[PDB]
Structures are given as structure tokens and as C-alpha cells.
């Protein structure tokens, strides 16, 4: 019997993504090697029909999304394809072509769902992971593309009424957008656009008074700090900043993380002039 | 099974935590 | 008497940068307004002769740097000019033109200085701040420029034998270079480049076990963590990671900063395969 | 005098901490 090397085996699975009779198992095997194979993304991108096969997997479940009928097995399979897209989103050789093909858009219907069943939560979290890995690269062109889409209202809806984990990733995505100069100007260009962000941030602080989440509070504070770099937003935050960020509500929680304290201390200092 | 088990769910959580932190 | 509005006052000082008789005082007044006037950078950049006058201030002290005869008065004046260049380096309207003019290169003679006197430390720290603000914008064009210069050995020198605060900012600059995909591949494509970085980082851990610095340890671990994303570096760090990063040497101080613990623990898990 | 007093040295570190962290 022949014992293929590992590179040959990966290419075999990639080739097996073309045909529907072998695709589900190939998706499973490749998704497991996502961490072990550093060049997996260009291997996927430059393979004929492969990216098209993965997008077909995504779109195949669109009819199960609205009305919500998605099964655990359908979510399982499509999230394997999504894990391969996250690999392509985060690799320097494929990231830019990934954006040029507008691939993140195919995940947005998944971000609109509100069903709390495990198949939908698993799909939503996996989709947020693709977008989160995309903005973590700190590339200006990522933010430019996202600003042409509805990503900000999508994140805000999840920040307000998602699971704590979904909220943390949605806030991180908003945080990366705000950290970009164009993104900060975008959100602050209209007082109504800014007001929507601030209202939703303010309500998250009220929840954080009841559910002390260190990871969520860190990114909420960071979004407030970056907003304080815009003069129009900085004047409004002097009045609409929740009182829980001024007293000692999160004092005992923040004593464990000095990085967030300095941010909150630099935030209140930027609101005094 | 081919469904969603605790290992898959926990591995996703660790993936997301490493992304945002 | 006429009460001149603030925008015209700022422009008066900007115009006074063009004459030697008034430049010093204008430098002082403008540097004090750096954080109050959000559009100071394009005002400076689009004013005739202003940038050329700031570069003349910098270049005017090149003969005082080698041999070291820089006075406190000279250092104070040029650091006011550097403070204005820092806000040009970080503004979205001017940063690209700042890079295309290759302005950061004018600061590198100051990073070669080794005098531990107050005029030289103040100049070195201020210069590091300009570069730190420039890389903090998380953009690829910044890192591309820096890689055509000798910024990396300059940072490594400072990380090895600079003051505690100088080490922190130089490590942060190296950190931002490592976080860029091109920067990581640049430092890791040659084993000599990687080992030089690893040797410097290894030595800083030893000093941190003697003189603890929470902020400096944070950026050292981040550099180690980002290096682990490169295969050749991960397998090498499996053998050359300092023992103080594997036991409870820093666990006493890390209990006050949860962010750094999540980084260090994530790093060793990648080294355990 | 026109020197580098102790306040200016402190304010520079404040700027550098805000950048670095």
C-alpha cells in the first residue's frame, strides 16, 4: 500500500471537495488540519473550483435559515466550510483576494438569525469568527470593504441581544472598525449613527452591572476610549457615560486587569478637558 | 452522530477567545 | 484690544515657525496645543515652509549628537518640533505624505545615541514616541517603509541596553512590526535574524526576573506569542524559552494583569504541540 | 532657563504609556 506524504493527503482532500459524494468528509478532515497546515489557505484558493465549492456549501443552507429549520448536522457541515474560509480570510497570500470576491457577504444572513437553538448559535459564532479573524489582521482594506456593508448594524443587534460570547466578538469587530480612522469618522459622521452606537454601548454597561464579564467589559471600554478620540463623540460622552463607569462598580473586577483600568482612567480623563 | 458536541462547542469558544484577546 | 479666535491664534504661531526670531516660542505654544487642536497636523502640513522648518530644527542638532554635546535647551527645542511631527505622523490626512517624504528617517541618528544624560534620554524617548505613534495606526504602508530602513537593529539595541521606558517603547515598535504579516516573515525568513531577536528577548526576561516591570513583560510576551505563529520560530522557542516564563517566577506579578497571563499561557500551549 | 524640568519628563512618559498600552 502507498503511504502518501502529508502534503499529498491534504491536496487529495482538497480535490475531494469538488464532488458532492466526497465533499462532506473532505471538509471534516481539512477543518481538523486548519491549525497544522500553515499554507492551507493558498492551497485552497489556488485550487480550481475549490472556493466555489465552499460558497456552494454556504448557500445550500440559505433555505434552512428563513424560516429557521437548520439541523445540527447541517450546521456542523456548513461550519466546517466556514472554518476553511476563516483560514483564507486570515492568510496574507489570500486575504486581499478574499475581500475582492466580497466573500464575507455570504455569512451575513447567518448573522441576521435570532433563533437560540444550538445549530443557529453554533453557526452564528462560527460566522463571527470568520469576520473576527478578518479584522484582527489590522489591514486598512478590510475596514474599507466592511464599511460598504451592513456590518455595523449587524454587530449592534448582536451586542444588544446576543449570547455573552457573541456579544464579545461583535464588540471586538466594532472595536476594530472604530480603531480605523475611516471607521471612527464613519460612525461619528452623523449624530444619529453615533447615538445608536452609544445607546447600545450604554445598555451593555447596565447588563455588565449584573453579569460581570471581564472580556466583554474590556472591549466595551475600548470602544468608549476610541470614541473619545472624535471631538463630536467626546462632547456627548461627557453627559451620556453610564454612572457605573465612573464609580466603583467594576472596581473589584478591574483590580485583576490593569490594562482595562488604564483605558477607563484615560477615558474619564479625556472627558474632562 | 454528526451533530454538535461539547468538544466542538468548546473548541469554537477557545478559537473566538484567541481571536479577540 | 482685539480678541483673536483660537484658529487664527494657531495659524499665527504656525506662521511664526518660518522665522528664527519667533520659531522657538511658536514651537512651545503649538506643542502645548497638540492634544487640543484635532486638525493641527493638516494645518502644519499644508502651510508653506512649515514642515521644512521643523526638519531644519531636527537637522540643526546633528552636529551636537556625535560627539555628544547636546544641551538641555537644544534637546527641549527639538523635542517640541518632534512633538509636532508626532501629530503629523498619526493624523489620517497627513500620515501617508509623512511616510512618502520619508520623515521618520530623520529621527534615527537620535536612536543611535547612547549617552544616558537627561538631554539625550529626553530626545531618545521623544523620538521613540514619534515612531510609536506611527506604528500604532496599524497600517501596512508604515511597516513597509520601516523595513527599508534599519529600524529593527536600532530597536534591538535599545531593548538590550536602554532605560526601562526606552526598552518598553522599542519593544512595542518591534511588536507592531511582528504583528504585520510582512514584518513577521521578514524577521523569520533568516535564522540569523530570528536568533538575534530571540537572544535579545531571552536576555530581557532575565533582567525582568531581577528588576520587575509589568508593562515591559507584557510586550515581551506579546513578541514571543506572535513569533510562535511562525513555524521555524515555534520549534526554536520550544528549546530557548526562558525558564522564568515556564514556572511561577512572574506568576506573583502577573496576578494583577489578567491580559498578560492569557498571552503567556496561550504561548506555552503552542509550544507543547 | 529653558531646560528639561521634572514635569516635562513625567508628561513624556504619560504620552508614551498611552501609545504603548
Numbering used by the authors:
A (entry chain C), C (entry chain A): 13 to 285
B (entry chain D), D (entry chain B): 790 to 810
What did the published study say regarding this structure?
The CCR4-NOT deadenylase complex plays a central role in bulk mRNA degradation by catalysing the removal of mRNA poly(A) tails, which is the first step in general mRNA decay. The CCR4-NOT complex consists of several structurally and functionally distinct modules, which assemble around the NOT1 scaffold subunit1. The CAF40 and NOT modules have no catalytic activity and have been implicated in mediating interactions with RNA-associated proteins that recruit the CCR4-NOT complex to their targets. Among these sites, we identify a short linear motif (SLiM) that is necessary and sufficient to mediate direct binding to the CAF40 subunit of the CCR4-NOT complex.
To elucidate the molecular principles underlying the recruitment of CAF40 by Dm Roquin, we sought to determine the crystal structure of the CBM peptide bound to the Dm and Hs CAF40 ARM domains, which exhibit 81% identity. However, only the complex containing Hs CAF40 yielded well-diffracting crystals, from which we obtained a structure at 2.15 Å resolution. The CBM peptide folds into an amphipathic helix (residues 795–810) that runs centrally across the concave surface of CAF40 and binds to a conserved hydrophobic patch close to the previously postulated nucleic acid-binding groove. The amphipathic helix of the CBM peptide lies almost parallel to helices α5, α8 and α11 and it uses residues M798, L801, L805, I808 and V809 on its hydrophobic side to interact with CAF40 residues Y134, L137, G141, G144 and A145 (helix α8) and L177, T180, V181 and F184 (helix α11). Furthermore, I793 anchors the N-terminal extension of the CBM helix between CAF40 residues A84, R130, P131 and Y134, resulting in a total buried surface of 1903 Å2 that does not include any water molecules. Finally, the CBM peptide is fixed by two hydrogen bonds between N804 and the CAF40 residue Q98 (helix α5) and by a hydrogen bond from CAF40 N88 (helix α5) to the carbonyl oxygen of G791. The CAF40 residues R130 and K148 may have additional roles in anchoring the CBM peptide, but they have distinct orientations in the two copies of the complex. Importantly, binding of the CBM does not interfere with NOT1 binding, suggesting that Dm Roquin can interact with CAF40 in the context of the CCR4-NOT complex.
